[PDB]
């Protein structure tokens, strides 16, 4: 597109966001929608049954109160938008002042940008590590603090899994072993129970609307299957997996077990910290450990094909980069593209929206792939989906658009700065502004109340706001960071568009974190090292792309990637341990203080029925 298309599109995206905020201001004041817009307060139990003033209110809660109110993962996520402003605001300013002889100017700027970015990341990594350590030290007792998950318990002809686990731990951790719970494959039973719930909803639907005999018959048949299955899963030795949740008397002991190799064969008796019981992805505990290697290989191949085939939708969007491509793809638009105003509106918004729609189901696919791979916790599944999404964006959204563009790399990049700018305004600015309306929950909330509610108690189930969406949010931020770092030395006018995005997204999400979103698991910012690593990868990619465009002076261009990686290793050595190792001293302090505070705690009673598959509880 051209400058006037950027101008027209910006005018429209600004006005559109403004309108969404007006609609929001109206909907949030209608009392029948409080259960949707203030869901967090209902979940906490703190709430009973101009127009942009919500912005200042979102900013009034101190970060420490937000950590206790919303959780640490929610706060650390939000700080990523803040990181974006810290990294790019001075880049946008210096790039403008200096770049808007030339060969060397570009090299110097590349160093200035890399150093600033690394400096900011170093400071952020230190900050997050300190928040994590304090958060964990003050964290309330929870079963995972004492529990490790043992995988690949070797077989024995005579002894059961339970006997092997009890014996191993009494012998090798004799002072602290307390109790264990063996993993059971109850996937069939769990599916029958979920199916029964769906059938029950249909029966309740038809009863409120009054087919009744049909749904009753399905309920009785499934109830019989459930009863039969409960007997078989409980007394069937093949339902027992060679895995167990092992609990210890102290946190110190659990830390020792979780952080050390137990046997001489490094692939057996594998120990890791257990997920909090609500963070356990129970279905994947039924996957035999040894199959995980093959499953990951298959998904790497499936990912290749997904990335490969998706090139076609990208090429389509790039065809639409010109007005001729637009009318050829959509001939019905010819009558309105002679008009200068509409030509700019369509040229701006159409390829932006088309790409956004094609990518709409991408995170569902990636989450399915992640589940196939066998991860056993919700937090791990979201981190892997974020990983794959990031790679996908690097190849299909960024490089493929640039290459396809040239088909319709050095020169190819500057030619697409405009495309990425209109994309950011549609996906970024208008995108987050519409998210605050949160239309999907309003619609589902009202449909449930209208047809699936028999009692007011059901209205507390209709209220499921979801969560921040680490797996769909983090990859968007990272794409914009990459575009910023790539375009900053060549087309600096891109940067103000990402700065508006980071600022707007920060205020919109801070609002949603406080009033709307729940948190499904608390990983205490365990994801931070991945966020850090992705930024480092983005710096390296930008530096290599610059070599191609600028040209090769090679020792300067080569040193940038080397120095950037050396920085990364410094940080892994110095800050990463706050996320991947649990100091024995810290474990001992919690144990000491807890004992003094609660001298009569029955720890075994507390932990004994934790980690029992919910279908049995």
């Amino acid at each position: 597109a051209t400058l006037q298309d950027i101008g027209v599109s910006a005018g429209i995206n600004i006005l559109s966001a403004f309108v969404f905020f007006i609609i929001f201001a109206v909907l949030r004041l209608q009392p029948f929608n409080d259960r949707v817009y203030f869901s967090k307060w209902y979940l906490k139990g703190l709430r009973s049954s101009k127009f942009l003033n919500w912005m200042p209110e979102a900013l009034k809660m101190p970060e420490p109160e937000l950590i206790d109110h919303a959780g640490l993962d929610s706060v650390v996520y939000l700080r990523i938008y803040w990181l974006g402003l810290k990294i790019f605001t001075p880049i946008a300013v210096l790039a403008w002042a200096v770049l808007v002889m030339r060969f060397w100017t570009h090299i110097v700027m590349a160093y200035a940008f890399t150093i600033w970015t690394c400096y900011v990341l170093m400071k952020e990594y230190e900050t997050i590590a300190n928040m994590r350590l304090q958060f964990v030290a003050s964290e309330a007792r929870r079963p995972d603090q004492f529990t490790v998950l043992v995988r690949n318990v070797p077989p024995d002809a005579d002894e059961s899994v339970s006997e092997l686990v009890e014996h191993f731990f009494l012998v090798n951790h004799p002072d602290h072993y307390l109790t264990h719970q063996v993993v059971c494959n109850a996937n069939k039973l769990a599916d029958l129970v979920k199916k029964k719930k769906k059938l029950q909803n249909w029966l309740d639907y038809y009863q409120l609307k009054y087919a009744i005999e049909h749904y009753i018959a399905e309920i009785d048949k499934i109830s019989k299957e459930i009863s039969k299955e409960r007997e078989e899963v409980v007394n069937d030795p093949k339902a027992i997996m060679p895995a167990a949740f092992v609990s210890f008397k102290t946190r110190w002991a659990a830390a020792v077990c979780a952080q050390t190799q137990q046997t001489r064969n490094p692939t057996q008796w594998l120990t890791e910290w257990a997920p909090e019981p609500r963070d356990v992805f129970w279905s994947n505990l039924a996957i035999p450990y040894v199959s995980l290697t093959v499953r990951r290989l298959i998904m790497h191949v499936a990912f290749f094909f997904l990335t490969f085939f998706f090139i076609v939708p990208i090429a389509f969007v790039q065809s639409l980069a010109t007005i001729e491509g637009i009318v050829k793809a959509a001939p019905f638009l010819k009558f309105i593209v002679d008009d200068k105003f509409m030509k700019s509106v369509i040229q701006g918004f159409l390829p932006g929206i088309a790409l956004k729609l094609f990518l709409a189901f991408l995170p569902s696919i990636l989450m399915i792939m992640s589940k196939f791979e066998g991860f056993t916790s919700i937090s791990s599944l979201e981190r892997r989906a974020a990983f794959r999404y990031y790679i996908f964006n690097l190849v299909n959204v960024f490089l493929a658009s640039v290459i396809a563009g040239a088909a319709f790399i050095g020169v190819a990049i500057p030619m697409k700065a405009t495309f990425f700018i209109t994309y950011i305004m549609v996906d970024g600015w208008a995108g987050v502004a519409g998210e605050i309306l949160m239309l999907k929950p309003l619609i589902m909330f009202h449909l449930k109340n209208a047809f699936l509610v028999k009692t007011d108690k059901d209205r507390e189930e209709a209220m499921d706001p979801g969560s921040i969406g680490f797996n769909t949010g983090e990859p968007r931020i990272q794409l914009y960071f990459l575009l910023g770092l790539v375009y900053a030395p060549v087309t600096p006018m891109l940067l103000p568009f990402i700065l508006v995005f980071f600022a707007l997204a920060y205020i919109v999400y801070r609002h949603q974190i406080i009033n709307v979103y729940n948190q499904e698991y608390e990983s205490a910012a365990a994801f931070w090292p991945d966020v850090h690593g992705r930024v480092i990868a983005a710096l390296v990619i930008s530096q290599l792309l610059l070599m191609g465009l600028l040209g090769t002076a090679a020792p300067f261009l080569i040193a940038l990637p080397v120095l950037t990686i050396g920085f990364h290793h410094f940080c892994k050595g110095r800050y990463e341990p706050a996320f991947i190792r649990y100091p024995l001293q810290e474990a001992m302090m919690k144990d000491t203080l807890e004992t003094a505070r609660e001298p009569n705690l029955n720890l075994k009673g507390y932990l004994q029925n934790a980690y029992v598959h919910p279908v049995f509880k």
């Binding site: 002042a97 200096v98 100017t105 110097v108």
Partner: peptide
């Protein structure tokens, strides 16, 4: 080498101000 580094640092600060003034304007 403390006796050389200290004034070297001072020379570098001036070198930076000069190079950037040239790039800036």
């Amino acid at each position: 080498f403390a006796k050389f580094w200290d004034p070297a640092a001072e020379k570098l600060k001036e070198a930076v101000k000069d190079y950037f003034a040239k790039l800036w304007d």
